[PDB]
């Protein structure tokens, strides 16, 4: 997501 | 879904503690998701406090960290929130919050008033 | 901090239209934003993450779209459910930090 494809999850909470 | 739950005091006086309870049920702490305090103040403004993660990692606002502590009990699936060294200006609308995908799931809040 | 500007403050409107509520950041935050409805009753829900993102069983009147620094929510064909007050989140920063806020109320 964002500018990317790429999301991530950091402490369980997903971000871009 | 996950439901959420404060409980605590109404009323703490300034220089002293405020401490809340959020009871969740439906959904483990220690599975996902980070585990949130947020307030909102009198004239509708919201402030992020803290979390602790499903691994028990905390995160806390640079504005309370010295002031704040947010604790877990996995064994009856509670989280906490402490601050401490209270003024008047912490009076507000507590509530607990899941984040995982955004802030789905929130309990429905409670007033603490401080005041002496 | 990273500030967000949410606008307008206030929306006098009828059942039925379309309304869009915009957010705009002190800095990129590259999606990292989410949106809540505040009822009657004080009680807050997430309806949407990641700048367009539904929660589960939020209505698809609910929309979101945006990149960097500038966010919108819209919501069409209003539903008397839908009268709140709305607010913008950032996950992209610590701290987390919020909008202002939009009261949405009834034209009558």
């Known amino acids: 997501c964002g500018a990317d494809s790429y999301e991530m999850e950091e402490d369980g909470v997903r971000k871009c | 879904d996950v439901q959420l739950q404060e409980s605590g005091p109404s009323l703490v006086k300034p220089s002293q503690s405020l401490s809340l309870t959020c009871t969740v049920t439906?959904?483990?702490?220690?599975?996902?998701?980070?585990w949130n305090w947020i307030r909102q103040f009198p004239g509708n403004k919201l402030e992020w406090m803290g979390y602790?993660?499903?691994?028990?990692?905390?995160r806390y606002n640079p504005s309370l960290k010295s002031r704040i502590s947010i604790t877990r009990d996995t064994s009856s699936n509670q989280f906490f929130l402490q601050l401490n060294s209270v003024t008047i200006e912490d009076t507000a609308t507590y509530y607990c919050?899941?984040?995982?995908?955004?802030?789905?799931?929130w309990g429905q809040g409670t007033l603490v008033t401080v005041s002496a | 901090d990273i500030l967000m500007t949410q606008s307008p403050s206030s929306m006098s409107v009828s059942l039925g239209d379309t309304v869009s509520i915009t957010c705009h950041s002190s800095?990129?935050?590259?999606?990292?934003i989410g949106w809540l409805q505040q009822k009657p009753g004080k009680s807050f829900k997430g309806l949407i993450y990641?700048?367009?993102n539904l929660d589960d069983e939020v209505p698809s009147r609910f929309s979101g779209s945006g990149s960097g620094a500038d966010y919108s929510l819209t919501i069409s064909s209003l539903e008397s459910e839908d009268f709140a007050d709305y607010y913008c989140?950032?996950?992209?920063?610590?701290?987390?930090?919020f909008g202002g806020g939009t009261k949405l109320e009834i034209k009558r």
């Open positions: 919050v899941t984040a995982g995908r955004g802030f789905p799931y």
């Open positions: 439906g959904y483990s702490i220690t599975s996902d998701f980070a």
């Open positions: 602790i993660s499903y691994s028990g990692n905390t």
């Open positions: 800095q990129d935050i590259n999606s990292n």
């Open positions: 990641h700048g367009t």
């Open positions: 989140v950032q996950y992209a920063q610590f701290p987390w930090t």
